[PDB]
């Protein structure tokens, strides 16, 4: 059948700690390949599969900044959502982002994904159209109408059909042994 790629982000605020803890886990189908741990001494995106470390420094330097910055954003997002919900700084809250894409049997594009959850409860989501957002609660509507202002429906749509499908396509052939097993 088809294939898939998923990135799983989690930013939890350690109250009384200046920066929250961050763990990023990437999977291709059901084979993890990358790791970025905030408390790790690396400060760098570490390989986790046997076929991803053949991607040279252009890849590890890329993936680090893209979620070094993804961790930074969630640092201001936990503080922004702390103001949306009238909540206090003694509380310890979690932010969970999952975005990914599905390729078909012929390298095609089949379906894209991006979902956000504040404390395990649905927040804002991406519709199949990839042109519409759905806000689960109220605070996700001040984020829904804020995102349609910068056309974030598109710039997520461009990552999903661009680097995500060509990333997933590039990995399915880089570790072609690992990813078509049974």
């Amino acid at each position, epitope marked *: 059948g088809s294939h898939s790629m998923r990135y799983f982000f989690t930013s939890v605020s350690r109250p009384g700690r200046g920066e929250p803890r961050f763990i990023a886990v990437g999977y291709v189908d059901d084979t993890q390949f990358v790791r970025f741990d905030s408390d790790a001494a690396s400060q760098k995106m570490e390989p986790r599969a046997p076929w991803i470390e053949q991607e040279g420094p*252009e890849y590890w330097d890329q993936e680090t900044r893209n979620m070094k910055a993804h961790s930074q954003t969630d640092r201001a997002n936990l503080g922004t959502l702390r103001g949306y919900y009238n909540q206090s700084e003694d509380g310890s809250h979690t932010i969970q982002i999952m975005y990914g894409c599905d390729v078909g049997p012929d390298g*095609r*594009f089949l379906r894209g994904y991006r979902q956000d959850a504040y404390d395990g409860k649905d927040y804002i989501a991406l519709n199949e*159209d990839l042109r519409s957002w759905t806000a689960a609660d109220m605070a996700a509507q001040i984020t829904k109408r804020k995102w349609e202002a910068v056309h974030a429906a598109e710039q997520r*749509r*461009v990552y999903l059909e*661009g680097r995500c499908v*060509d990333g997933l396509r*590039r990995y399915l052939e880089n570790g072609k042994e690992t990813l078509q097993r049974t």
Partner: antibody
Amino acid sequence: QVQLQESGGGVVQPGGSLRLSCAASGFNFSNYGMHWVRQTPGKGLEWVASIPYDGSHQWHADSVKGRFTISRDNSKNTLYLQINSLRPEDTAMYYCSKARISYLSAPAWWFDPWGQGTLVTVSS
Amino acid sequence: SVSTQPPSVSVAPGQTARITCGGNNIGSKSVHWYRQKPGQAPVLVVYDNNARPSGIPERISGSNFANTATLTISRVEAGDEADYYCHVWDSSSDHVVFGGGTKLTVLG
């Protein structure tokens, strides 16, 4: 397995009208925009026209505006380019290409993949 | 709406080739690259400044900053001989703008 097949071209005389057609297969054609980009032999690429996924609007390059009209038939998965009042300048190869990203309200992002194209040559 | 490429680039096998696509504020546009060999259709090799498609080998890399986009082909093979067109969208023109094209020659 995105596949594009141009046809309908050939050798015509100036003043006549011509209809190019691009047959598409290997994707939900109703969800992507389509483009026509022509190339005069021995010269660079030149954008002609483009149409969003639905046919709502119709984008024209200035070099072919008023004379050309681009349309699409989603039920047949076929893209059409109509050329009116053929001139020696319309002598070029006409590629048809499928916008990578979906639902584009404007032809802004890269074109992948390109069809092999059809050749239109006019003379007396 | 004017993006200008060198007419041709000659490079020794195994060396590193470099094709430019100069343009006013092209660093703020999304540059793409197509390689057209004689008798075939153009093929996407670099999109959104630096991203590579699925089939493209990592030797070919993109670049785009300030007023100069750069296509870089490291370890040039004989199969890299073709014309190369960059692709932008002039927001303030409603015109997709190809460069003049560059005939990359890997001399034998």
